[PDB]
Amino acid sequence: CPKDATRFKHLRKYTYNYEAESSSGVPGTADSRSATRINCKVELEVPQLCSFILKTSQCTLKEVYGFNKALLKKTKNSEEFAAAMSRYELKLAIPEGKQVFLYPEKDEPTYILNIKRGIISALLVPPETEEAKQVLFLDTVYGNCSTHFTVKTRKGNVATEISTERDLGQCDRFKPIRTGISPLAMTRPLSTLISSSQSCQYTLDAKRKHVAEAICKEQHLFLPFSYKNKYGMVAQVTQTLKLEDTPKRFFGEGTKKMGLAFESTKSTSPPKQAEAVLKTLQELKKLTISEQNIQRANLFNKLVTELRGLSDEAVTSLLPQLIEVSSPITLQALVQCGQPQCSTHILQWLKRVHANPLLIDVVTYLVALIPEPSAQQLREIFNMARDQRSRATLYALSHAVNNYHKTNPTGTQELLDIANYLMEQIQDDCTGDEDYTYLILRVIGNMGQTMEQLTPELKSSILKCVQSTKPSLMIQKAAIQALRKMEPKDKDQEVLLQTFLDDASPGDKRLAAYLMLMRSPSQADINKIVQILPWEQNEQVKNFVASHIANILNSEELDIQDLKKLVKEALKESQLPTVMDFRKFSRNYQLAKIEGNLIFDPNNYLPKESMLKTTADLIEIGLEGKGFEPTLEALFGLSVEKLIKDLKSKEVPEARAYLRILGEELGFASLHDLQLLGKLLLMGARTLQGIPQMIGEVIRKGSKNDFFLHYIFMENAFELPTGAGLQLQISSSGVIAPGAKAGVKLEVANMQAELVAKPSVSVEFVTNMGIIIPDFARSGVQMNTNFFHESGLEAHVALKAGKLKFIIPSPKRPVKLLSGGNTLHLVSTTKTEVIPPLIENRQSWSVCKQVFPGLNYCTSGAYSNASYYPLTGDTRLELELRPTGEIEQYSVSATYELQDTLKFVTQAEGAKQTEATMTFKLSSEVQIPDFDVDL
Ligand SMILES: *[C@@H]1O[C@H](CO)[C@@H](O)[C@H](O)[C@H]1NC(C)=O
């Protein structure tokens, strides 16, 4: 801490008045600007030298809504904003004069923090020097930059008046930021084509060398097409401090030694500022009837803006409200959003509309394998899996939790929620749904290692499943390999051994327990097993264990060499007995340890269990089967006549194979799964038979759908140094939006028909710097130039009272042909409103021509001829066809009036009425009103 680093005296508080105005727009062309006024009363407490405390009160924000005179009022966000302002005090350290440190409140919101940082950034003032003009590297809210120590005027010894420049394009913290761009998406070139600087002045006092009053202003101009770097899309932000009083030890130390460097905060608006998002969808409802699809691309841009500023909680809460107005537009908006929450949304909608839940589970299973998990998506996939519990859902969740743990080893509460949900699923000892219990065991046998640090009950519950034989034998076994990927604890190993020595235990169960234990072998257990085996009765498990002993003793791997030596030392008293025929005896073929396990009931010889390993735990192949020995004995144990009748009498075949790769159980298939597949094919056949029924809905007609497809081809949005503290983001979006409004409504029996689907294309170059205060206010003006073309025709053919009138409806809305030229819009936090176009020098040219009787092919435009175009001002270029009113529309009418006066009239109804009429008897009339050849 230098002797005279600061120009302030401790034990002398400072009552200052902070102000700021974030004006934005195009100078010269007009004067109406998008500005967000803000002011507050700042209490600077001074515990000691180079130690400060910040308090603030009466932080009132004012919003521009009119001119005569910048009309200002109080926002609905202002009160809670000031509440956050006065919620906490701040601590400031500036040791050594250069090093500056922030001590914030731990719970103080980060945007509030950087707001305060921006406020205090201008508060720094560098001590005087002999040179009136100087340039020094000084830190700001965005790190060290080149300040300009320029004495406005000096009293020789002192200079109360002073000025400083900081060209913001030369700041250390000038780095841009990542943004929630469209997934189908240039930073430094954008920095080049923009301006960023501050230039301002300050007033000290001669009496006490304290800043009397300071004022700062900045410039942020879209350089291309700008006029002498002084006109065009510019953002000028103010920051003014006004002293009011300097009233009258301990300094509050903060644990977080935060730096004055700006912290990136995602631009956002609260539900109060995000209420109109539903109206943001209602707007494209208007083109349902208004059909003026020129602004549809701009509407989609508004959608992009609101979703970027949206909150996950709100959107998740009101997704059905989003989707109700029209599903596919909402879906494509979510796709193009580029925001993580969108990923969660659609499937939540999907199950909400029963849109083939089978493929819903399929796609969720597909997406759960991503290596970039999110907690909210984990919660919702857990919820949906609990909902339907299909194989795909459970496998998806099983892989997703492992992926999340691998990516994020840090534990979270949702993992505990999943764990207790699972232990509820198994209840006490896995007495629930047999196949569901099997599937959830297959699940847990993958991430129980991840959850090992979470709940010790994991083992305690599942051993209850292991010990209790109330569940069926298959689930009984599955309880063991639920622990297969689990590290056996001492209690686990003891329970395993106690269940293991049971002779009434099935041979496969005992062997599986043996394998699970020998995962972590114990010398005493091996000794007792070796001493028991000579009197062992189950021959096939004896062959299996002898094979396993041979595998370990002959394991050439040095990793198993020590274990082989230990087993040889144990078996020195007596070696293992003879090995049986591996062709027809249960034996472990632990062949890089590839293990073959063909185990059967000692009564029979067909291996009920066929396990194959591969090795990390590369691949695991298993299969448990039963009910096939009677099938074999059907002929093995003239015949065909009795066999055909005996087919149904055979015991029900029962098989279930499974595959687990990299620990995670990939999936299993059983004969029950096979008949499930048969039922699924039956459902598919029903769906295929449903199309004859669907043709009724097809012919029901009476519909109109605005198939408009949006896209963003350029997405380069970021954040750059904001002098106003409130973030200066940068939005750049080129948006295309073609599409047609197609719908069916007719009546064949009534002889009714019409034409639909006029297609059109729109373009939006939404580009500026976003002067937006996250959750508080938004200001600025993006470039608004639209390249729109209109095409397609609509007709209407009907028949009534025998009059076959074939109407050619000229639309009430004149049909456009091409649109071009800029039409800008002052964008406010509440609602953007059209920027008024220029008047002088805007040649209001309008070339029209009644090319066809009743219709006018016309075009018009205006632009002033001093920024380069289109920054010069509003530009118009519109070519279209408009009804002249003399003909409201055309219609070809015909009625078989027997006399027969079968009229054939091409009436062009309207103020004028031209028609070719044909009535034949033979009355050969040929009427042409235009040339008036009315034969
Ligand atoms: C000032 O800029 C210099 C350039 O040498 C740099 O070393 C220093 O860290 C900067 N100071 C701050 C406070 O950013």
CSV table of C-alpha atoms and ligand atoms in Angstrom, one decimal, residues 98-100 137-140 142-145 172, ligand 1:
chain,number,residue,atom,x,y,z
A,98,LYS,CA,-2.0,-1.7,-8.6
A,99,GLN,CA,-3.3,-5.0,-7.1
A,100,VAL,CA,-7.0,-4.8,-6.5
A,137,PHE,CA,-1.6,1.1,-17.8
A,138,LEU,CA,-4.4,1.0,-15.3
A,139,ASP,CA,-6.7,-1.8,-14.3
A,140,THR,CA,-10.5,-1.6,-14.7
A,142,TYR,CA,-11.9,-5.5,-17.5
A,143,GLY,CA,-8.2,-5.7,-16.4
A,144,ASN,CA,-5.3,-3.5,-17.4
A,145,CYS,CA,-5.8,-1.1,-20.3
A,172,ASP,CA,-6.4,-7.3,-21.6
B,1,LIG,C1,-0.8,-4.0,-16.4
B,1,LIG,O1,-0.2,-4.4,-17.7
B,1,LIG,C2,1.0,-5.1,-17.5
B,1,LIG,C3,1.8,-5.2,-18.8
B,1,LIG,O2,3.1,-5.5,-18.5
B,1,LIG,C4,0.7,-6.4,-16.8
B,1,LIG,O3,2.0,-7.1,-16.4
B,1,LIG,C5,0.0,-6.2,-15.5
B,1,LIG,O4,-0.5,-7.4,-14.9
B,1,LIG,C6,-1.2,-5.3,-15.7
B,1,LIG,N1,-1.9,-5.0,-14.5
B,1,LIG,C7,-3.1,-5.4,-14.1
B,1,LIG,C8,-3.6,-4.9,-12.8
B,1,LIG,O5,-3.8,-6.0,-14.9
